[PDB]
Amino acid sequence: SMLWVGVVSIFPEMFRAISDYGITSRAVKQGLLTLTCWNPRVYTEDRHQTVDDRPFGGGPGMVMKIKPLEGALADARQAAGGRKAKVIYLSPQGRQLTQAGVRELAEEEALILIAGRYEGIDERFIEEHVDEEWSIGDYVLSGGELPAMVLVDAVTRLLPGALTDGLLDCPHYTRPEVYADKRVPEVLLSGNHEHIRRWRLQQALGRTWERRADLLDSRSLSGEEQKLLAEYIRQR
Amino acid sequence: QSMLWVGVVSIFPEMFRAISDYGITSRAVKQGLLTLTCWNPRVYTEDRHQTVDDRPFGGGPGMVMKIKPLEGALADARQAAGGRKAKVIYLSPQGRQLTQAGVRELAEEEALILIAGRYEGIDERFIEEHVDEEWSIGDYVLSGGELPAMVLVDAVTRLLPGALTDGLLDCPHYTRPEVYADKRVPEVLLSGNHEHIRRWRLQQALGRTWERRADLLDSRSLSGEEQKLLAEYIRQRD
Ligand SMILES: CCCCCCCCNCc1ccc(CNC(=O)c2csc3nc[nH]c(=O)c23)cc1
Ligand SMILES: CCCCCCCCNCc1ccc(CNC(=O)c2csc3nc[nH]c(=O)c23)cc1
C-alpha cells in the first residue's frame, strides 16, 4: 500500500464519503491506499470519561482532552507499523493547502490526520504531537472532517495508478459538435497536435489572465506564452 | 418556508450523507432551516449502463460530462426549487476562490443549485448556457466537486439565522488537567478574572494572526485597544 492514512475524528462514519465513493474508494480496493479511523471517544479512561471537556477560563463550547487524543494517536502510530508517519492537524490557523503542498504530502508513506471540532483541541497536544497544521481556505467550517477528506482526495489523485503548471485549465468539449446553436472550436474538430496544444495553452493562459491574474505575478511567462497571451487579450 | 433551499447535481448523491447526517447542516435540515435535495444526472441517461461521460473533442486523456444528463437534472432541480430566485453554481478549480466574504454573499441567496462535476470537467457550452457563477474552494486539484459542494453548504449554513464578529485566528484552548507531562495552563486562565481572560484571548488571537497570517491584518483596520495589545504581544515575545 503506497500510502497509509489514519484519521483521528469523533465521527469516523463521515469518512464513508471517501472510502465508499470516487477515486479514493477505488484506491482502497486497488490496494493502493489504506484508510483507517481512530475515534478518540474509545481512548478515554472510563465511560463518564468524555472525549472533550469544559474550557479553562470559562467560555462557551468544549475543548478536546489531551489523553483521548494521545491514546488514538499512539494506537494509529502502532498500526502504521514501521512507516514514517507525519501528523497533520486540520486547522483554520494552518498553512493554506495548494497543489505544491499536496505534492509534498503525497511523498509521505504514512499520514495521521487530526480533525477537531468547533472549539478545538488543547494547545499542549498540538505543541507536543502535531508536525504540520493545514487549512483548506479562508472560510469558516464547523469542523475538520470535510477538510480531512479534501486532503485525502487531493493526495490520492497523485498516487501512481490511481488516475498544476500554475495555470487554470482550457475549456473542455464533448459530443455533439453543435448544441443549442453553439459549436465546438474548429481547431479541436479539425487540427493537428501543434494547433490544439497552442490553442489549449492560449485558452489556459487567457482564462488565468482573466480570472486569476495573481497566479501570473508569481509565474514567469515564456516567449510563446507572452505572445499567445497578448494575442488572446487583443482577440477578445 | 425554509431559509435556504439547496439542490445538488452530482453522480454520487450518497456522498452528501456527510452533511445531511452530521453537524450543523444535519441540524438545519431537522430544524427545517435548510432543505437539501440531490439530482443524479445518471437517471437522465438513455442507455442501460448509465454513462454520463463522453470522449473529449480534440483528443486528450479522460472524459467530459455530457450536456444532456446535466440539462435534465438541472431542469428538474429548477422545477423543484419552485418560485425561489435560484443561483446556479458550478464547483470548479477555474472559479472564484471562496472566502468568508464570498460565503456571506452566497448566504443572502434563497435557493442554490450546485453542480458537482466529475472526470476532467463538464462541457463549456453547458457552463456558458446554464451556470451563473463558478467557485473554487482552493488552489489544489480534487477528483470531484462533491467535497467542495459540502464545504460550501457547511460554510453557508453557519450563517443561517438560528443555525448556531472578528476575522482573525483563534486564541489557544486549554482543558483539564491543569498540568500534563510538565506543561501547565497559563495562570491568567486559571485566575478567573472576566476582563483579564478576555484581553489575554484577544491579544493571543491578534498575536497568532500577526505571526502566521499577517495578510489578514493588511486588509483590516485594528482599533486602538487591539493596536496596543498586538504591539505589547510583539515586543513581549522571544
Ligand atoms: C476571544 C478570542 C477568540 C478569537 C476569535 C477567532 C475565532 C475564529 N476561529 C474559530 C473556529 C475554529 C475552528 C473551526 C473549525 N474549522 C476547522 O476545524 C477547519 C479545519 S481546516 C479548515 N479550513 C478552513 N476552514 C476551517 O474552518 C477549517 C471554525 C472556527
Ligand atoms: C491552481 C488551480 C489549477 C487549476 C487547473 C487544474 C485543472 C483542472 N481541470 C480538470 C479538473 C476539473 C475538475 C476536477 C474536479 N474538481 C472540482 O470540480 C473542484 C470543484 S471546486 C474545486 N476546488 C478546488 N479544486 C477542485 O478540484 C475543485 C478535477 C480536475
Nearest CA distance, A11 vs chain B (angstrom): 8
**For the CA of A134, the nearest atom of ligand 1:** 21
**Can you give the residue range of the structural domain that contains A7?**
1-163
Q: Count other Cβ atoms within 10 Å, centred on residue A119.
A: 17
Method: X-ray
Three cell numbers, residue B30 = 431537522
Looking at A102, A136, A163, the residue that finishes a domain is: A163
**B30 burial type by CB count under 10 A (0-12 exposed, 13-18 middle, 19+ buried):** exposed
Q: Are residues A183 and A152 in the same domain?
A: no
**Which residues does ligand 2 sit against, CB inside 6 Å?**
A 99, 164, 168-169; B 91-93, 117, 120-121, 136-145, 148
- The resolution of the experimental structure, rounded to one decimal in Å, is 2.7
Which of B102, B137, B146 has its CB closest to that of A136? B137
Looking at A120, A136, A163, the residue that finishes a domain is: A163
- The answer to whether B167 and B222 have CB atoms below 8 angstroms apart is no
Q: Are residues A104 and A211 in the same domain?
A: no
Q: Are residues A96 and A202 in the same domain?
A: no
Amino acid making up residue B175: T
Q: Are residues A110 and A25 in the same domain?
A: yes
> What's the CATH code of the domain at A115?
3.40.1280.10
**For the CA of B168, the nearest atom of ligand 1:** 6
- The answer to whether B23 and A143 have CB atoms below 8 angstroms apart is yes
Which of A57, A154, A173 has its CB closest to that of B189? A57
Q: What are phi and psi of B142, to 5 degrees?
A: -110, 170
Residues 6+ apart with CB under 8 A from B7: B37, B38, B39, B77, B80, B81, B86, B111, B112, B113, B114
From residue A236, how far is each of A117, B125, B127 by CA, in Å?
47, 18, 19
At residue A132, the 3 state secondary structure works out as strand
Comparing CA positions, the residue from A143, A174, A227 lying closest to residue B55 is A174
How far does Cα B168 stand from its chain's mean position?
Answer: 18
**For the CA of A116, the nearest atom of ligand 1:** 18
- The answer to whether B58 and A173 have CB atoms below 8 angstroms apart is yes
**Which residues does ligand 1 sit against, CB inside 6 Å?**
A 90-92, 116, 118, 120, 135-137, 139-144, 147; B 166, 168, 170-171, 201-202, 205
Amino acid making up residue A82: G
> What's the CATH code of the domain at A218?
1.10.1270.20
Q: Are residues B189 and B232 in the same domain?
A: yes
Looking at B165, B180, B205, the residue that finishes a domain is: B165
Three cell numbers, residue A154 = 487531493
Comparing CA positions, the residue from A2, A49, A50 lying closest to residue A28 is A2
Please work out, in degrees rounded to the nearest 5, the angle formed at the alpha carbon of residue B63 by the alpha carbons of B59 and B68: 115
